[PDB]
Amino acid sequence: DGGFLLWWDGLRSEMQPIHDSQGVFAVLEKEVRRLGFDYYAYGVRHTIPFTRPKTEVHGTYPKAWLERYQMQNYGAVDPAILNGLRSSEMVVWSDSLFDQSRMLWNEARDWGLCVGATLPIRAPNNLLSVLSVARDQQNISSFEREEIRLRLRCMIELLTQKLTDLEHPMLMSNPVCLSHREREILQWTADGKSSGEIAIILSISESTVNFHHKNIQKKFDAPNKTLAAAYAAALGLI
Amino acid sequence: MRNDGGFLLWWDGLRSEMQPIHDSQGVFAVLEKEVRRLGFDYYAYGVRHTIPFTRPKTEVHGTYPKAWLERYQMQNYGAVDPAILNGLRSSEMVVWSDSLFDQSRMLWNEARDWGLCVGATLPIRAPNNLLSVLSVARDQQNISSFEREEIRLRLRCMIELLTQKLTDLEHPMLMSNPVCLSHREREILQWTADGKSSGEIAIILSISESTVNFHHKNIQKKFDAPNKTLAAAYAAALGLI
Amino acid sequence: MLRLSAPGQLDDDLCLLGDVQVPVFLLRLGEASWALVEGGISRDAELVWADLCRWVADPSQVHYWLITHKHYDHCGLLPYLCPRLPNVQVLASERTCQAWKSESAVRVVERLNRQLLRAEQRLPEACAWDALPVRAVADGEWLELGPRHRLQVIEAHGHSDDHVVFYDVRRRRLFCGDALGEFDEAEGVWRPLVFDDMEAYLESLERLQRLPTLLQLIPGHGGLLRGRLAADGAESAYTECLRLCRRLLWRQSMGESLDELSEELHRAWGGQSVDFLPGELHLGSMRRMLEILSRQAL
Amino acid sequence: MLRLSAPGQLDDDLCLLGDVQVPVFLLRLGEASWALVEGGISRDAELVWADLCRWVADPSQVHYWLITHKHYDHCGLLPYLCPRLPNVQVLASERTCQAWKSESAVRVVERLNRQLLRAEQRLPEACAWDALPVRAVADGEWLELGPRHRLQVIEAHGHSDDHVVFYDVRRRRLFCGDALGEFDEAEGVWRPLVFDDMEAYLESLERLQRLPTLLQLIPGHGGLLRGRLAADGAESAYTECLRLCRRLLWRQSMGESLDELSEELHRAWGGQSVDFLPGELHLGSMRRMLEILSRQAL
Numbered sequence A: 001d002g003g004f005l006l007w008w009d010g011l012r013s014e015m016q017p018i019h020d021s022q023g024v025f026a027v028l029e030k031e032v033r034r035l036g037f038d039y040y041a042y043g044v045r046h047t048i049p050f051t052r053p054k055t056e057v058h059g060t061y062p063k064a065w066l067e068r069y070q071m072q073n074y075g076a077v078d079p080a081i082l083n084g085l086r087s088s089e090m091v092v093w094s095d096s097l098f099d100q101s102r103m104l105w106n107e108a109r110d111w112g113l114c115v116g117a118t119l120p121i122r123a124p125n126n127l128l129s130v131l132s133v134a135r136d137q138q139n140i141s142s143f144e145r146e147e148i149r150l151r152l153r154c155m156i157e158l159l160t161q162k163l164t165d166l167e168h169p170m171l172m173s174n175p176v177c178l179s180h181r182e183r184e185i186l187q188w189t190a191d192g193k194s195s196g197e198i199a200i201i202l203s204i205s206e207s208t209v210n211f212h213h214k215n216i217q218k219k220f221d222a223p224n225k226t227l228a229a230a231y232a233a234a235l236g237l238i
Numbered sequence B: 001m002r003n004d005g006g007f008l009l010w011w012d013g014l015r016s017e018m019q020p021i022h023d024s025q026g027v028f029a030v031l032e033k034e035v036r037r038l039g040f041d042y043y044a045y046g047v048r049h050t051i052p053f054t055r056p057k058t059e060v061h062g063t064y065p066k067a068w069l070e071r072y073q074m075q076n077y078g079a080v081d082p083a084i085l086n087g088l089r090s091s092e093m094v095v096w097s098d099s100l101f102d103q104s105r106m107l108w109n110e111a112r113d114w115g116l117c118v119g120a121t122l123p124i125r126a127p128n129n130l131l132s133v134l135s136v137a138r139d140q141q142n143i144s145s146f147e148r149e150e151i152r153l154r155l156r157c158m159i160e161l162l163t164q165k166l167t168d169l170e171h172p173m174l175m176s177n178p179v180c181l182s183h184r185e186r187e188i189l190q191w192t193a194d195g196k197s198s199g200e201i202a203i204i205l206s207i208s209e210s211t212v213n214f215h216h217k218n219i220q221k222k223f224d225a226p227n228k229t230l231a232a233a234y235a236a237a238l239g240l241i
Numbered sequence C, D: 001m002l003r004l005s006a007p008g009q010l011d012d013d014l015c016l017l018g019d020v021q022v023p024v025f026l027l028r029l030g031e032a033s034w035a036l037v038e039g040g041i042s043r044d045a046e047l048v049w050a051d052l053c054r055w056v057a058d059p060s061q062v063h064y065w066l067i068t069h070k071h072y073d074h075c076g077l078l079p080y081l082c083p084r085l086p087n088v089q090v091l092a093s094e095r096t097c098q099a100w101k102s103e104s105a106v107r108v109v110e111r112l113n114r115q116l117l118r119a120e121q122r123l124p125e126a127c128a129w130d131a132l133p134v135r136a137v138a139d140g141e142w143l144e145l146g147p148r149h150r151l152q153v154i155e156a157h158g159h160s161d162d163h164v165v166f167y168d169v170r171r172r173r174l175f176c177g178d179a180l181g182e183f184d185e186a187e188g189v190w191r192p193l194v195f196d197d198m199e200a201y202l203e204s205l206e207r208l209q210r211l212p213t214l215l216q217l218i219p220g221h222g223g224l225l226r227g228r229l230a231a232d233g234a235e236s237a238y239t240e241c242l243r244l245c246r247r248l249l250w251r252q253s254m255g256e257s258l259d260e261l262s263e264e265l266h267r268a269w270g271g272q273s274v275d276f277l278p279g280e281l282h283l284g285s286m287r288r289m290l291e292i293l294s295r296q297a298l
């Protein structure tokens, strides 16, 4: 019937021949400006460093706003990104949403970020990603909210897949590969059994398993088993 | 914006239809009605956990033959089911074919024997890291290229709302082992998850050794742990840190 | 070609019996199970039978008859061909069968259909409408007609008080009847027909949008459709009904009489359907239509 | 009332002038300065002055002029009124100013304006087309016409590469020119106008229907539009462009050449542009439109 479905097929077929990230973000900017929004951003929240989870982001906002993030790092306290952790629902911005951290919202509204929304999604590799879209005027009605939801959902799905395929620095975290014995021994450590129990069930001497443990610690760059097990569980390798 | 009608108006209709429902059987009933309206006979919704790392627990509901369900409970194909495991690698809907099941053909043959020859299995990672898949299946009428993308979008919207509604209704599938951490339990377990020793944690946090070891005993007790590694692993997998 | 219009075969399992302006379709459910669809008119009985026996070994294999509508252009073929068929479950809506039981509706339908007869032919012998083998189908009922046909009844009210549409889920096909309109053979865009209500018509078209995209869309007049214009039919019908609302309200703001516009509608649109509507009663039908448009949806 | 036609005190601050079919819109924005829009055709000048002095006491106060695109039916008054208006300032897209500086696309404008002249008429003196004052205005550039008005230029292509539409936020009126289409006095629904590109045309109508619910809407032909017509005028123009696309694609499917459809559109819709466009040229214009639509629409 044309409209949405033909649009999705056309966008997919048009994004297929694009072999560069800048082309992907160019078509994204063109579509988001067709959707009525001046600014966009694609923001990936990692989950490896638990104390300081690094949030990295691309987009077309004022560059000094980006710089403001690299000084104060509002991604670690921004509620728009943090909504994706608790729920996968789209959230449209308001003064109510940012009551916990009003400094970010006030500084945003200072620089022409007064209307917008942010759709999160859990990527298949456990890395949270969000697509935000913003404009000055024309507060998002409840009528347009579902259309923006569907179109941002399609766009963020495609971008997530493509930027994973293009080996973008945002999506790709520290690459770690394990053969099946290392995955098995690390899984048995994740379902934590003592070393003697592991040796008994696997029927292998303690020296070989300790050699495997040292290999895993070196590969993850760990000082203890807990870092390796937690990082592997978070990254989904186990 | 009344130009496409179509998917937007359908999504509004299904959301309004599912909003006043307050029972899981009603949710599965409306999902069943749409999937038979879509063309496919059977469906399924399968939530794969990641808590027990050695043997991941998968819980599945739907309308398939009950003996096929009992086959799943017999020999646990959910760990071996490639259609479920594709959700880990990529978020693609994948139509079933003999190429996909090359690593595990016994499941494919036993499914094809009982009227599961055409179908699809769309995955999605739930917001608390639980994997979920919404599958549809039928006997004949192989999925043409014209129909595939509409199936992809419709199944994606339905699994999104299905997971949201079942989490709202507290189904056993989506509700993981309930662990409620305070702010300081989250902080101490996070700092443990970064491989920092107890003395170093005490030094940076400015709290005595006995208090942090008491908290370590506690967080071992709630996770039912014999080791810190299990607690940290479970916490990382569930999103608790 | 998008419009598969002429009689005979239309698909692997679907024929068109009789004239395309009042078509009578025929689903081949199985090797010995058939199903006629949409009905016809009284004059075409000896025509449609002459088609049906060509496509069927003997009439006993026909099992179902899916009627969408109450008006004479669909119910008309029932009493003249149904006795011939020894067993057919005429599936019509709950309110359809009430009309056929009613003594008022049968007289109206039979009179309106007897006007269309040519001077020569008399009609075949027929039973009363009350004695038909009817079945009631509700909103959203699942019709397991055969192994290879699963139809869903959807109450597409508004064009009439009992309208339903049968949607084949597997083949993505919709025997929509007059729920959409009279497909303009000349121009290409739809043509609204709201004869009993206007609010319900738009809601029915919203549900027809809620159906997935349609490979085929079969109206009650015009044969079959395919391609894009069969996929946005509910969008196009919603569009055209809104356009007619705009046209009527604008012309009434300009102050011309309500009947003045309806005569223009008859002049523009009745040439297509002159051969299965009387020329005079199209004017009255469009008069009642435009009165409903003036009444509702300001 | 929904289409205020005749010249007069058309709104609280706005006054139509000249012929209603191709007017120039005067805006009251100060007790010193004034402003015109939609610069019409050459022959209206002696008419427009006879109206303009009835509103403006002394035309030195007339500071600004707004122009929508380079076509003759929106810029005829420019060379014939700008020199006698000493403080005049014409606003239009960069492409529009470049078009007027170009030697080509001005002789054709002169021919099109001259074709619509009376027998004994003699147009007044005129400066060179490049000599008149112009300040190019781009997409989204906020315009400060006066303390009481703050217009917003909007890049709205599709009717031409040089097109704009001036939009006011406070009173929520809009000057479209031919961004939408020639409004229909009889039928009420818009007549689309595509002469350079559909893809820019429908994009423009998307970006114009995303605006607030417009209280007023002022095309370049046929006065002001008010109420429900102005509220969803951006929707109906998009709908009508798609409708004509459906009609053209259907006639291509049937096999009719473009000559028949362009002829049909000309004989249907020649009831307005006879005053300010020759009939022989309107056929060619509709032919170009239908060629663009056929080439671009799927």
Ligand SMILES: O=C(CCCOc1cccc(Br)c1)N[C@H]1CCSC1=O
Pocket: A041, A042, A043, A057, A058, A059, A060, A061, A062, A065, A066, A067, A069, A075, A078, A080, A081, A104, A105, A108, A113, A118, A130, A132
């Ligand atoms: O956090 C987000 C989405 C990711 C932001 O992406 C950005 C932000 C600044 C520079 C650049 Br480049 C990208 N958004 C909104 C919340 C309130 S303010 C804002 O930017």
Ligand SMILES: O=C(CCCOc1cccc(Br)c1)N[C@H]1CCSC1=O
Pocket: B043, B044, B045, B046, B060, B061, B062, B063, B064, B065, B068, B069, B072, B081, B083, B084, B107, B108, B111, B116, B121, B133, B135
């Ligand atoms: O992928 C899935 C979804 C998980 C299992 O779904 C099922 C299977 C049986 C009963 C129920 Br209830 C759900 N099913 C497919 C894998 C190959 S065949 C089959 O049943």
